[PDB]
């Protein structure tokens, strides 16, 4: 296939087809299906050498995962696209791979046609001839110690719709079919000891036609707020390379992480300074907090088990993203090895962001005044994991800060509640016979930094009172305080949590350089306070399958292909074994001071549902920021034209 404009560009549709033809030929005569066909990114060293040192062009490689009929687990490998050849391959008989949209599409018809499932619907109050009204959200089984990875399994969380336009989540059923993904058959049904028949209440609906019935009428359309950019946008795109307000970076995308931002630099008045080699979300875990069987199996690692790319929404013009928008499409492979496209998967636009800075002089009643307005650049996607919606916004700012904003919406996962059953303390009755279980949403932000170049370190920064007491010569009035910086020397040192007691932040810094004013190394500081402890206990299934989630920060040495901290193939892993973050941490002794490092940050929220969240939940925001501190020698935005500026002398001339 033709070479891309840029080594980090995602595989084109032609490259995906070329890769799958190559793989089909290599396994000729075998019955195989495609699970993953994606860019294998060039080695970090090879990329930097190519980009900055006139070095070798890295080979264009595709990583694939396939299944073979009648063979356990998966096969994976690499295709060299230039030579149309498989160059690496291996069979992994004891793992299970990510569930694609197709993998999961099939489950509902399997359960609708299964005699044991039909029997359970009838027992639950749904007649056998109304199976078309039965739906399920096909989840990964997550992990079930009865089958391990020996079969590829889904669990069907079952619901009922009185009409196809209903939101089904007011009507969960009590039982849980277990489905063999590849054999397309129900192999078991978890049946509760206490049966609860289908709710007889009206569905809790949310479309305008439903709302008219429920509350009498919709609100009139509000007078509009119109955003226009009649002279175009300030950002410039060259293929997938973005240039805006001195930032330059590559916007990549894949089946798993969704948006991947690479080769991020800031043009500091002609001096182009690296900041990050790569930043993305690398895994998630959404652990539920009901201990009752089988609810322990609700702890989706959405990124590893379904994929933020696979799950991503086509973004419908003028609606999800308001204003003048640049869109990118996403390309994957289906099971047959044919390219599939999701149109308008990523939206790119710039937005007003209030004030950047202002100062006025009281001396002439603020006549002396300067105000400069802020614009932000937003690179966004929205993905749907069954009930949930995750709106993801990568935000670049004119003071050089970078922010990740997330908004959680969609629908609560619900289970049935008996008439006289108490949902607490593990959940909330959000509607009659509806129990919305407690759960956390946790994310693993993966940062491969290059703060002002190569050779970086990380530290925890804690605000502390002076150790000297009130009334001492050193602290006479007891007001002294400082920032205690703990530089991480080894992996073990880095395993740290957010602490409200010290308003903890973390620095990622270049110990080889010095700010000529402050004397401190250039850094980007992680400012992040939505950092829940992992509530699941040590040794729990949740804690074992997501070793990264137990600490707010994990810093490990860089190696190639250290992307996914719960391992490469997540579904049905028990959490036993040295893989992912557990492998990378090892015995905790490896050096992480002044070297190539990877910084994985766990953040998110703890959700205790309330009726406000039902039947459709208003957006709940999550955010973290990476701020330049001691990176610049002064406010980098001062060369932006103010919205208003008047000097003292000018103010005098006009009185």
Give Cβ neighbours of residue 40 (< 8 Å, ≥ 6 apart).
61, 62, 63, 78
218 is in an annotated binding site: no
Q: Are 102 and 335 in contact (CB under 8 A)?
A: yes
Question: In the 8-state DSSP scheme, what is residue 4?
Answer: P
* Tokens matching residue 287: 């652990």
Q: Within a 13 Å sphere around the CA of 154, how many CA atoms are in the beta-carbon half?
A: 31
Under rule CB under 8 A, residue 94 binds a second copy: no
Instruction: List Cα–Cα distances, 135 to 166, 197, 311, 468, in angstroms.
Output: 11, 16, 19, 66
303 is in an annotated binding site: yes
304 is in an annotated binding site: yes
Distance CA(109)–CA(154), nearest Å, equals 13
Distance CA(584)–CA(579), nearest Å, equals 8
Residue 469: which of Cu ion, a second copy, none does it interact with, CB under 5 to 8 A by kind? a second copy
CB of 408 to Cu ion, least distance (A): 6
Which residues 400-429 are close enough to bind a second copy by CB under 8 A? Answer: 400-401, 407, 409-411, 424-426, 428-429
515 is in an annotated binding site: no
169 is in an annotated binding site: no
Under rule CB under 8 A, residue 355 binds a second copy: yes
* Tokens matching residue 576: 């036993």
Which residues 167-226 are close enough to bind a second copy by CB under 8 A? Answer: 167, 204, 206-209, 211, 215-226
CB of 479 to a second copy, least distance (A): 5
Question: In the 8-state DSSP scheme, what is residue 121?
Answer: H
305 is in an annotated binding site: yes
Q: Within a 13 Å sphere around the CA of 155, how many CA atoms are in the beta-carbon half?
A: 22
* Listed ranges 36-44, 415-423, 553-561, 599-607: which one lies at the site for Cu ion (CB under 5 A): 599-607
- The residue with tokens 């090895």 is 337
Among 79, 86, 104, 111, binds a second copy (CB under 8 A): 104
Give strand pairing partners of 602.
444
597 is in an annotated binding site: yes
Which residues 432-451 are close enough to bind a second copy by CB under 8 A? Answer: 432, 438
Residue 537: which of a second copy, Cu ion, none does it interact with, CB under 5 to 8 A by kind? a second copy
Among 75, 562, 607, 629, binds Cu ion (CB under 5 A): 607
* Listed ranges 164-172, 423-431, 515-523, 606-614: which one lies at the site for Cu ion (CB under 5 A): 606-614
**Residues assigned a catalytic role:** 302, 388
Under rule CB under 8 A, residue 236 binds a second copy: no
Residue 54: which of a second copy, Cu ion, none does it interact with, CB under 5 to 8 A by kind? none
Q: Are 417 and 434 in contact (CB under 8 A)?
A: yes
Under rule CB under 8 A, residue 148 binds a second copy: no
Is the C-alpha dihedral spanning 18, 21, 26, 32 positive or negative? positive
508-547 footprint of a second copy as x/- string (CB under 8 A): -------x-xxxx--------xxxxx-xxxxxxxxx----
H helical segments located in 505-610: 541-545, 580-585
Among 48, 241, 386, 495, binds a second copy (CB under 8 A): 386
Under rule CB under 8 A, residue 641 binds a second copy: yes
Q: What is the dihedral of CA 15, 17, 21, 26, to 10 degrees?
A: 50
385 is in an annotated binding site: yes
Residue 28: which of a second copy, Cu ion, none does it interact with, CB under 5 to 8 A by kind? none
207 is in an annotated binding site: no
Is residue 297 helix, strand or coil? Answer: helix
Under rule CB under 8 A, residue 496 binds a second copy: no
Give strand pairing partners of 460.
486, 506
CB of 9 to a second copy, least distance (A): 25
Among 314, 418, 453, 511, binds a second copy (CB under 8 A): 314
Q: What is the dihedral of CA 199, 204, 207, 213, to 10 degrees?
A: 100
Under rule CB under 8 A, residue 642 binds a second copy: yes
Give Cβ neighbours of residue 610 (< 8 Å, ≥ 6 apart).
428, 430
DSSP letter string, 612-649: GGSSSPPPEEEEEEEEEESSSSS-TTTTSPPSEEE-HH
* Listed ranges 6-14, 251-259, 465-473, 583-591: which one lies at the site for a second copy (CB under 8 A): 465-473
Distance CA(310)–CA(175), nearest Å, equals 28
* Listed ranges 91-99, 119-127, 462-470, 570-578: which one lies at the site for a second copy (CB under 8 A): 462-470
Under rule CB under 8 A, residue 649 binds a second copy: yes
Residue 85: which of Cu ion, a second copy, none does it interact with, CB under 5 to 8 A by kind? none
Nearer to Cu ion, 446 or 607 (CB): 607
- The residue with tokens 């000097």 is 647
Nearer to a second copy, 26 or 244 (CB): 244
Residue 375's nearest CA partner among 637, 162, 24, 655 is 637
Distance CA(113)–CA(620), nearest Å, equals 38
Distance CA(459)–CA(484), nearest Å, equals 10
Give strand pairing partners of 253.
259
Nearer to a second copy, 69 or 207 (CB): 207
CB of 4 to a second copy, least distance (A): 27
Nearer to a second copy, 348 or 543 (CB): 543
Q: Are 565 and 553 in contact (CB under 8 A)?
A: no
255 is in an annotated binding site: no
Nearest-Å Rg of the Cα atoms of the chain is 27
Under rule CB under 8 A, residue 336 binds a second copy: no
Distance CA(404)–CA(652), nearest Å, equals 45
Under rule CB under 8 A, residue 50 binds a second copy: no
- Positions of E strands within 466-619: 481-487, 505-509, 523-527, 553-557, 597-607
Nearer to a second copy, 23 or 436 (CB): 436
Pair type for strands 481-487 and 457-465: antiparallel
Under rule CB under 8 A, residue 54 binds a second copy: no
Residue 638: which of Cu ion, a second copy, none does it interact with, CB under 5 to 8 A by kind? a second copy
Under rule CB under 8 A, residue 354 binds a second copy: yes
Residue 82: which of Cu ion, a second copy, none does it interact with, CB under 5 to 8 A by kind? none
Among 184, 499, 559, 589, binds a second copy (CB under 8 A): 499
In angstroms, how far apart are the furthest CA atoms of the chain? Answer: 90
* Listed ranges 42-50, 148-156, 272-280, 368-376: which one lies at the site for a second copy (CB under 8 A): 368-376
308 is in an annotated binding site: yes
Under rule CB under 5 A, residue 601 binds Cu ion: no
441 is in an annotated binding site: yes
543 is in an annotated binding site: no
Annotated binding-site ranges for substrate: 300-311, 385-390
Annotated binding-site ranges: 300-311, 385-390, 439, 441, 448, 596-597, 607
Residues that bind Cu ion (CB under 5 A): 607
């Amino acid at each position: 296939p033709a070479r891309p404009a840029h080594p980090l560009d995602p595989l084109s549709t032609a490259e995906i087809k070329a890769a799958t033809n190559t793989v089909k030929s290599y396994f000729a005569g075998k019955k195989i299906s495609f699970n993953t066909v994606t860019l294998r990114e060039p080695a970090r060293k090879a990329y930097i050498q190519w980009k900055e040192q006139g070095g070798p062009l890295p080979p264009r490689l595709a990583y694939y995962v396939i299944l073979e009929a009648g063979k356990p687990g998966v096969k994976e490998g690499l295709v060299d696209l230039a030579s149309l050849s498989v160059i690496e391959t291996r069979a992994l008989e004891t793992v299970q791979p990510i569930l694609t949209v197709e993998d999961l599409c099939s489950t509902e018809e399997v359960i609708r046609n299964d005699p044991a499932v039909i029997e359970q619907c009838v027992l639950s109050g749904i007649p056998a001839n109304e199976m078309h009204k039965v739906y399920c959200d096909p989840w990964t089984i997550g992990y079930d110690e009865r089958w391990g990875t020996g079969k590829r399994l889904q669990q069907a969380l079952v619901y009922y719709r009185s009409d196809e336009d209903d939101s089904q989540y007011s009507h969960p059923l009590d039982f849980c079919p277990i489905v063999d993904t590849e054999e397309k058959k129900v192999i078991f049904i978890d049946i509760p000891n206490r049966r609860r028949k289908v709710s007889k209440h009206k569905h809790a609906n949310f479309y305008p036609k439903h709302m008219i019935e429920k509350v009498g009428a919709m609100r009139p359309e509000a007078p509009p707020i119109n955003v226009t950019q009649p002279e175009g946008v300030s950002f410039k795109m060259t293929g997938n390379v973005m240039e805006w307000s001195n930032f330059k970076f590559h916007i990549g995308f894949n089946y798993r992480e969704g948006i991947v931002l690479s080769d991020v630099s800031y043009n500091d008045h002609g001096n182009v300074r690296p900041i990050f080699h790569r930043i993305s979300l690398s895994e998630m875990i959404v652990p539920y907090g009901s201990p009752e069987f089988p609810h322990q199996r609700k702890h989706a690692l959405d990124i590893g088990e379904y994929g933020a790319g696979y799950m991503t929404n086509p973004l419908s013009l003028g609606c999800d993203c308001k204003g003048v928008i640049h869109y990118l499409d996403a390309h994957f492979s289906d099971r047959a090895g044919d390219p599939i496209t999701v149109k308008n998967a990523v939206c790119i636009h710039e937005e007003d962001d209030g004030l950047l800075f202002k100062h006025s002089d009281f001396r002439d009643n603020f006549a002396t005044s300067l105000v400069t307005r802020a614009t932000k650049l937003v690179v966004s996607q929205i993905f749907t994991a069954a009930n949930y919606e995750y709106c993801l916004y990568w935000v670049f700012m004119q003071d050089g800060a970078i922010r990740l904003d997330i908004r959680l919406t969609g629908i609560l996962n619900t289970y049935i509640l008996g008439d006289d059953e108490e949902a607490g303390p593990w959940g909330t009755r959000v509607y009659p016979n509806v129990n919305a279980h407690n759960h956390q949403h946790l994310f693993s932000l993966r940062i491969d930094p290059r703060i002002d170049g190569d050779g970086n370190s990380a530290a925890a920064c804690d605000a502390k009172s002076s150790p000297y007491p009130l009334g001492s010569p050193e602290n006479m009035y007891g007001n002294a305080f400082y920032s205690e910086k703990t530089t991480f020397k080894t992996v073990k040192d880095s395993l740290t949590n957010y602490e409200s007691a010290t308003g903890r932040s973390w620095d990622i810094f270049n110990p080889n350089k010095v700010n000529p004013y402050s004397g401190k190394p250039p850094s980007y500081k992680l400012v992040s306070t939505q950092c829940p402890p992992l509530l699941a206990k040590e040794g729990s299934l949740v804690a074992k399958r997501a070793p990264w989630a137990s600490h707010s920060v994990n810093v490990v040495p860089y190696k190639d292909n250290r992307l996914y901290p719960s391992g490469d193939h997540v579904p049905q892993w028990s959490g036993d074994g040295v893989r992912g973050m557990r492998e990378w941490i090892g015995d905790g002794s490896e050096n992480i001071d002044n070297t190539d490092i990877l910084f994985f940050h766990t953040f998110g929220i703890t959700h205790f549902p309330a009726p406000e969240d039902f039947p459709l939940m208003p957006a709940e925001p999550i955010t973290l920021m990476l701020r330049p501190r001691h990176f610049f020698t002064e406010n980098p935005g001062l060369d932006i034209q103010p919205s208003y500026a008047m000097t003292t002398s000018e103010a005098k001339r006009a009185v």
